[PDB]
Design a protein around this ligand. Structure first.
Ligand SMILES: O=P(O)(O)COC[C@H]1O[C@@H](n2ncc3c(NCc4ccccc4Cl)nc(Cl)nc32)[C@H](O)[C@@H]1O
Ligand SMILES: *[C@@H]1O[C@H](CO)[C@@H](O)[C@H](O)[C@H]1NC(C)=O
Ligand SMILES: [Ca+2]
Ligand SMILES: [Zn+2]
Ligand SMILES: [Zn+2]
Length: 525
């Protein structure tokens, strides 16, 4: 006999509860808007009504991304994931943004579906407090069968969030294998690994973890597609991505990009012993052709009311596209990057009573901290909401005194694994950097000119290794985030500065009309 399972899946929704523009920014032209829970619901229901055996799965990073999360703090996530009748979720690295308390009380206690992570181990007083609220696996009934779903979360989570020192993030493969074996001994022949580690780790899992039939991932924002893709996202491989396992089997790996723009859709065809005979599908583009469900939309609008406080007051206006996309800001100079740094610099110079930092002209900004673009087409209005999506962490723009040799080392770190859309890539201000990627990591920086401080007229002179420089940057980087160990360890002074979003709102309010360009601050050769 045969048994067909349809896996529906989302990942990295990032609090895009409402429908959004093509590029994930705030929705304005509703006729061309995409995604959102209301639209998703409609599509999920069409599938549920057509297919008898269906599972709806999330692979983490529902938390953090828009004012939805700033205001409702995870309660919106639980509430609307419950309304969509999610079958399971894997804990993501952003689910630990508001601490463990901020995971437990809004989400884990209010979610009506199992929330999973096998490689997160609770220790000390936390263990008994959190016992049962998340699980390593869940065995779900699906018709006359059962499907084991085993959870995992990125080992990078303690460096990217706030899980605390009571949670230990074990290696995924080590953590998973006993759980998958345990399931086998419980006569569970169909096993899905749902987790939040990235496409590369998902592939390793499929290869290395005996017993796993399917891997449904997230974290890396990977778009997979079989055929001609329906939008601007460039596929990284076929959907499903077939990994050939060490134990001689074809294991489908899947992911569904990000921002609720696509619903992932995989039909698995199983035998009576839970082996994958075949699988096919593609991620479904959630566009205007799919109507928003009326009930969910009405419910969204009810919850929306509280949020409209953050959209009312126009801070200012842009007359250019503010390119805060991952694809620009992690790979090259992006004008949103330049806007944010110029604001960091400018706002700091307002504090004239402070003697030490009032000629600071140099800025570095982790591109991965830039989380949304802003559109210029509705008279390019900029509200607080628009700004919250760009900078959703709520950190500070701190001030550091760094040696020249430290900065060279940071800019070397900035491109040490270039090509993988990682967040360490540095947007800059008062700095003209030139990379040669043909060279090896640790020696990719061929030119690094910075603005002189001890000079009457500021010009760009070469960074000297033994000179000392004053730089403005996010506290995340100052605290040694994004693997910038050299900053934390080699900084000479570190002063806590102003709140990130306030700095950029204050700047925009001051300027009225903004038009940041790409000027050749970061060049390649
Ligand atoms: O998003 P994901 O697809 O799950 C993985 O993205 C990874 C990238 O995001 C950036 N990042 N990560 C974290 C991060 C932070 N504070 C994290 C943080 C620290 C303490 C408390 C709460 C939080 Cl929330 N602050 C900035 Cl200003 N930037 C950041 C990096 O650039 C990295 O490479
Ligand atoms: C929605 O996506 C489908 C499938 O890619 C496409 O054929 C259709 O034109 C799209 N409709 C829009 C953008 O209105
Ligand atoms: Ca099996
Ligand atoms: Zn994410
Ligand atoms: Zn993530």
């Amino acid at each position: 006999s045969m048994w067909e399972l349809t896996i529906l899946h989302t990942n990295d929704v990032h609090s895009r509860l409402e429908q959004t523009s093509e590029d994930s920014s705030k929705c304005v032209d509703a006729s061309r808007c995409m995604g959102g829970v209301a639209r998703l619901f409609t599509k999920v229901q069409q599938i549920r009504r057509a297919e008898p055996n269906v599972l709806l799965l999330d692979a983490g990073d529902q938390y953090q991304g828009t004012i939805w999360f700033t205001v409702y703090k995870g309660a919106e996530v639980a509430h609307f994931m419950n309304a969509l009748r999610y079958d399971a979720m894997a804990l993501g690295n952003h689910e630990f943004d508001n601490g463990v308390e901020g995971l437990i009380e809004p989400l884990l206690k209010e979610a009506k579906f199992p929330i999973l992570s096998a490689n997160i181990k609770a220790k000390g007083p936390l263990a008994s407090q959190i016992s049962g609220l998340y699980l390593p696996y869940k065995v779900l009934p699906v018709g006359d069968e059962v499907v084991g779903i085993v959870g995992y979360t990125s080992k990078e989570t303690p460096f990217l969030s706030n899980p605390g020192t009571n949670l230990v993030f074990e290696d995924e493969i080590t953590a998973l294998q006993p759980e998958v074996d345990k399931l086998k001994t419980l006569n569970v022949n169909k096993i899905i690994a749902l987790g939040h580690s990235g496409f590369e780790m998902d592939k390793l899992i499929a290869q290395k973890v005996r017993g796993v039939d399917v891997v449904v991932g997230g974290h890396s924002n990977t778009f997979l597609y079989t055929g001609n893709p329906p939008s601007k996202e460039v596929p990284a491989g076929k959907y499903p991505f077939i990994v050939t396992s060490d134990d001689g089997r074809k294991v489908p790996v899947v992911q569904a990009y990000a921002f609720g723009k696509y619903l992932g859709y995989l039909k698995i065809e199983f035998d009576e012993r839970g082996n994958v005979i075949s699988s096919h599908g593609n991620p479904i583009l959630l566009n205007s052709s799919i109507p928003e469900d009326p009930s969910i939309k009405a419910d969204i609008n009810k919850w929306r009311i509280k949020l409209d406080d953050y959209s009312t007051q126009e801070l200012g206006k842009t007359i250019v596209y503010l390119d805060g996309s991952s694809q620009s800001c992690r790979f090259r100079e992006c004008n949103m990057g330049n806007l944010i740094c110029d604001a960091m610099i400018n706002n700091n110079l307002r504090h004239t009573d402070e003697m030490f930092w009032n000629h600071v002209s140099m800025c570095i900004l982790n591109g991965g901290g830039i989380r949304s673009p802003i559109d210029e087409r509705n008279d390019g209005t900029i509200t607080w909401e628009n700004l919250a999506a760009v900078l959703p962490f709520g950190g500070t723009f701190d001030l550091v005194q760094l040696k020249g040799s430290t900065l060279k080392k940071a800019f070397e770190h900035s491109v040490h694994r270039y090509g993988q859309s990682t967040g360490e890539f540095l947007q800059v201000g008062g700095i003209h950097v030139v990379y040669d990627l043909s060279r090896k990591p640790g020696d990719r920086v061929v030119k690094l000119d910075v603005l002189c401080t001890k000079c009457r007229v500021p010009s760009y002179d070469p960074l000297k290794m033994d000179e000392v420089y004053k730089v403005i940057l996010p506290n995340f980087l100052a605290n040694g985030g994004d693997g910038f160990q050299m900053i934390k360890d080699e900084l000479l002074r570190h002063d806590s500065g102003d709140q990130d979003i306030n700095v950029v709102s204050t700047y925009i309010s001051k300027m009225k009309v903004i038009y940041p360009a790409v000027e050749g601050r970061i060049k390649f050769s």
